[PDB]
Amino acid sequence: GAQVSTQKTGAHIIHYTNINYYKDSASNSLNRQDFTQDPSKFTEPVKDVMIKTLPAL
Amino acid sequence: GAQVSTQKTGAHIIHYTNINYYKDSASNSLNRQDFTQDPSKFTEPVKDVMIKTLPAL
Amino acid sequence: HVNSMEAYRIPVRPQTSSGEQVFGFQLQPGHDSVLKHTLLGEILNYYANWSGSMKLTFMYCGAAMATGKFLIAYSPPGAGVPGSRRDAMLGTHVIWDVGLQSSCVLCVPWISQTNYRYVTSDAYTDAGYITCWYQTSIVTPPDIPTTSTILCFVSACNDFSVRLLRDTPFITQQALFQ
Amino acid sequence: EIYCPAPPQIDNGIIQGERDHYGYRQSVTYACNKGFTMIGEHSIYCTVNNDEGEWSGPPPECRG
Amino acid sequence: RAVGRVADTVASGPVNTEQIPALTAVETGHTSQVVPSDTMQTRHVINYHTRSESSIENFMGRAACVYIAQYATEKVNDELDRYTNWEITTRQVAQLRRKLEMFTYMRFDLEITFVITSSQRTSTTYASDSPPLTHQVMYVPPGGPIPKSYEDFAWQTSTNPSVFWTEGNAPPRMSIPFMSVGNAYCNFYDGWSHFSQSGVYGYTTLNNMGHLYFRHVNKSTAYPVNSVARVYFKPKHVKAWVPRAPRLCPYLKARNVNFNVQGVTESRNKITLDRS
Amino acid sequence: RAVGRVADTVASGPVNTEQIPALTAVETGHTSQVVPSDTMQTRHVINYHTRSESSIENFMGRAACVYIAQYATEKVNDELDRYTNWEITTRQVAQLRRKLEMFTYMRFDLEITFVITSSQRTSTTYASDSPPLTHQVMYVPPGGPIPKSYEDFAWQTSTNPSVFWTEGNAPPRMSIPFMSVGNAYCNFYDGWSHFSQSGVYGYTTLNNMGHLYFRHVNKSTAYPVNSVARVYFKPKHVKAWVPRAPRLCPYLKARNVNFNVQGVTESRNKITLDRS
Amino acid sequence: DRVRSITLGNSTITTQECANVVVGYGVWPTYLSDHEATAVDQPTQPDVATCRFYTLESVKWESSSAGWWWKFPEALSDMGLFGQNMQYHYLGRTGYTIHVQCNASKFHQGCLLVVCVPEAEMGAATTDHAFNHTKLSNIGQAMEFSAKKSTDQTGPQTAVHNAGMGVAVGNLTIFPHQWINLRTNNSATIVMPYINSVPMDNMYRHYNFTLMVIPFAKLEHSPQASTYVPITVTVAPMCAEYNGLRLAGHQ
Amino acid sequence: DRVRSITLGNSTITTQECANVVVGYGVWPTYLSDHEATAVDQPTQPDVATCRFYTLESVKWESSSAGWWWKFPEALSDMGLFGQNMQYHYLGRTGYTIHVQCNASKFHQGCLLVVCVPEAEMGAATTDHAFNHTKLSNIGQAMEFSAKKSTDQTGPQTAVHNAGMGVAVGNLTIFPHQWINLRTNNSATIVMPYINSVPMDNMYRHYNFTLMVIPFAKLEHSPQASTYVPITVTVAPMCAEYNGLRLAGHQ
Ligand SMILES: CCCCCCCCCCCCC/C=C/[C@H](O)[C@H](N)CO
Ligand SMILES: CCCCCCCCCCCCC/C=C/[C@H](O)[C@H](N)CO
């Protein structure tokens, strides 16, 4: 059961191959390809939403 | 003849690959993924069944 | 009394005042001297974590005409050791009545902030205390001896689980055997 | 508070746990010495019927 | 739910009924099946706890040392000869022996690892240029021709399995099938060896698994060197039958189950507790 | 756009309106979301800049040393014994400790690497022929039997994991799952150890991860040799919760968060600037 | 069968010689509905933290015994979070489950009447003299009827043949009751719903009912038998709720 | 508008110059679900009797002030049935609503930072010396940061520019916070959900977070103005539940 995913190349043959050998999941490689982010918990932790064009007060 | 089974991961890419190389069966890997259990031989070794809510005598 | 069969014998006798303590030990099923050397002790000492609830099944081994009542209590480790029966009735408890059924199962539940507790005890995962108090008394007819015996069995429920294999601190050696 | 007597006790026995002042519902307990067998119970306690005293029952005795 | 997943606690309410889940009888020899939701009020928790580390393959499947085989390059006695031997038995260490006497009958495939560590013997001087030493480990079956000495042509490994190892590399590994003649490895054999109830008592008469002969392939060294060969058994594909009570008292002999008596547990000072 | 790709600046024109994107209120505790195209005129550039090197797997996923374990072949004291130990804690170095106290709760799988470098001890002479030394690294869980000395049968690795290594090869590597009993690795534990608010304060009471015992498998050496074992932790599959402010003052103790006070930043001479 | 098991809160009670369960006047204890209620505030309803089997102190059955009476809820005033929710609240409405238990032998004899008397207003020992509020009901210790008439100056009337209230003591069997007959019975259990003319009331100035136990046939055994048989009461609230949270009382 | 009204339990709070409400890390406080829980007992959930606005003591904003820190829940340990449910229970899980309020005038000036720091482990004043458990957090009185470094033998480090924990004090704005700017703002309110790595924990040996208020721009007014401006904290638990009822602690 092979897995073929996208390599990390620059933005103006682009694949790689991963076979998990060991039976656990602690024995995997690093998960270097997760770039999801949600910064509204720290930037906008407010109860009433505040539009950036309206006055906040 | 490849075999693809489930890795051991926690419970809230998850596969592995096993090719047996040697012709025997003593030369296999460990069978770390058998979690079947039947404890009623040691807990309930009785001839007449005893329901846990009825009195045993 | 460990070098005889008097180790397993919890003695009970007719009392003069109710509410006295039968026995008492900490709930450490891999480290406490009561529970670490039993069948739940020698298997749990091969590991490092344990989860799930346990049982504590009793058995009155007295005369068939005697009569008693007991209150077996497990208290979580917040406020310390329960001092009397009034302090131990507030926690978990089971009132055991001695009749034709000669056994009663206190099922010590699983109350913890951590998913696992350590076998060799650390103060972060302390687990509690198990007591037992005279609920009323022992009342006997004439021509029956006073000292009786209660046998206490320990088991695990169907939600027990252990983790983190290690080697037992019970079988040591210096040199090889020949 | 009212206080029970000492009391003047006892023949052929001994005192276990003597406090000087006895109050409400506190019991004295008397064990007969080694060489004497019982006549009745051991422990009596203090009662209240009026504003003063008193003890509950008669003191025990032992034969040998 | 998945396999090996422990059961969860169902919800319960304040009952007042003729059902008594707490009262039972131990005289029937039946362990109680009391859920914690039978004697109190519990919520509905979901237990994701797996019983993975408890199975006999996960339990026994860790390599444990069984012997410390000492041999040298210049014979000084018969305990430190030019070769050595080891009658194959797993009852010489104290750690693996207790794990195998937790069950009466076992049936396991083995895989053996040798960690062979030479060390220079003390002398007046030590300066020499030494080629990397080579070790031979021959497995003589029960009944084969044992090597009476070094430089003997019983070491020819004509049919017996033999491994060779030049120092510096990975440790050697070979796997062994279920080598008994019965149908399980009897850890305990309550009986005698002869039919008139005599001979030797116990499991000595059933342990017939051969020998294991170690030697240096290199003929000479300018200043002698004492090697130490440690053998690492590890069971796999293991079945286990008729569980025993685990052994209390520590061992004395490698063939008997002889023991001194001791107390059942550690002693405290009083039976109750006292603190308010 | 792809994931982890930063946003680009839209076009803008000269506005004259009742919309005020620049005026806000910090009293609400809300960081402003002012695009540069809100307070000036910007073009339409397209940003291909990825945020790859900022994620917690790319950030923490580099191996950092945590201990320098020293042991020898001839005991001179108890700091340079024939074996040694290390109570497992990642708070003994200053580099990795700051990367882990940037978040309160972490949950990471580990992989451990040992770089073991022997070096000959000074003496009168040094000429000898030495076999390649072998090292054993045993991981005792919290509560197991520790080896009181060398030549003890607690080193039998009957159930504890142990690695062996003959000098000259690649460094050893093993991977470790999420070994806690809670649900996250508490880097900070603001509380006491006993219930009456006493004992020891802080995260010392929660770090119960065991020990790590190092020794030489080779019994002797003609002239002694001091080995140095360095341990290289590297987190992977990492989650991180509740980010802390990064620590200003440098550390003092490996169990406390004790510190000396210092200024918030480096001081200049005047608040303004002067040049025409 | 003759076995029953009650489980309330985190604590359970098992019996093996149990006669039956007398559920008051035929009413299981319930919560206050939306059309019987008067207080317009939101009530606090602790399910497991309050409704559990608080055990009292065990009283001794002498051969010359007369009887004992408890007064609820003021006899449950220093047990658990019951005695803490009673302080921080003006109102309070609950039902109870009272389990009186006494085992001796098959060679003892005796018979108790175990009754729950709603609003047992007790007469004075010496008239034109208002008696004390602790000679009616101390916090944990029961009280004791006398064998003869009382001559106290500031106590209640404790002649047990007049039951304290002034009625014939044998006429108490309309209040929900059982018997503990040492020939057959072992333990008596009564489930008493909330009995009052108001939906909720204060807990300190009003004892909603009174648990009296009285030995009718006295305890007699051989001299070589067990000369100490105890009587333990194990009372549990049921369906409790409180209203009007203010600072801690009770003055 | 600039007006908001919070109603929890039997008590309400009205503001007329309120900036906003900072709901933690974006999480409203909730109860423990059936798949995050560990304790197998039934929890007691008092709705109105616990979740209400307990007000603390009002501290004085001096002109030479440094700052103050409270430590929750141990700063709420003698208020109402919160401090009684904390004694009779091993575990405890709750969220909070913290309302710091301070009005002076339109002729005063000053600016506070009002922050809720999860697990603010504090460094010692004199090292190699374990400090006292009451120099971190007394039961009702707040604590006070010093203006300079501390030289105490058994206290914490109270230099306010290092915030006690050892970090820069200006970097505290990632923990959910507000500001009380006397030019515009009047009161700061933060809704903090339950933040811990375990579902439920003990309440006495663990302070789940720490409310620090620090005057950044100091209080300065005319000499003929009001020379006493107070700072009151009004904290309310939310969605509280407790587990494992045993006798009263906390030793
Ligand atoms: C090239 C070298 C190969 C070496 C081959 C050796 C294989 C023989 C090992 C026998 C495996 C079973 C060991 C005996 C276990 C017993 O049943 C119990 N311990 C009873 O004492
Ligand atoms: C064969 C040798 C195997 C060695 C096994 C060691 C694995 C144990 C390592 C524990 C991993 C977590 C380390 C502790 C991190 C803490 O949560 C924080 N640093 C708090 O101080």
Automatic annotation (TrEMBL), chains A, B:
Major location (coarse): host cell
- Report which superkingdom the organism of origin falls in: Viruses
Gene Ontology BP, a term:
symbiont genome entry into host cell via pore formation in plasma membrane
- Keyword Magnesium, does the record have it? yes
Name one cellular component (GO) term.
host cell
Could you list this entry's UniProt keywords, alphabetically sorted: Capsid protein, Eukaryotic host gene expression shutoff by virus, Eukaryotic host translation shutoff by virus, Host gene expression shutoff by virus, Host-virus interaction, Lipoprotein, Magnesium, Myristate, Pore-mediated penetration of viral genome into host cell, Viral attachment to host cell, Viral penetration into host cytoplasm, Virion, Virus entry into host cell
Molecular-function annotations in GO: structural molecule activity
The places in or outside the cell where this protein is found are: Host cell; Virion
Name the family the entry cites.
Belongs to the picornaviruses polyprotein family.
Q: Could you tell me what this protein does?
A: Lies on the inner surface of the capsid shell. After binding to the host receptor, the capsid undergoes conformational changes. Capsid protein VP4 is released, Capsid protein VP1 N-terminus is externalized, and together, they shape a pore in the host membrane through which the viral genome is translocated into the host cell cytoplasm. Component of immature procapsids, which is cleaved into capsid proteins VP4 and VP2 after maturation. Allows the capsid to remain inactive before the maturation step.
Q: How does it assemble?
A: Interacts with capsid protein VP1 and capsid protein VP3 to form heterotrimeric protomers.
Question: Mind telling me what this protein is named?
Answer: Genome polyprotein
What's the source species for this entry? Echovirus E30
Q: What is the lineage of its organism?
A: Viruses, Riboviria, Orthornavirae, Pisuviricota, Pisoniviricetes
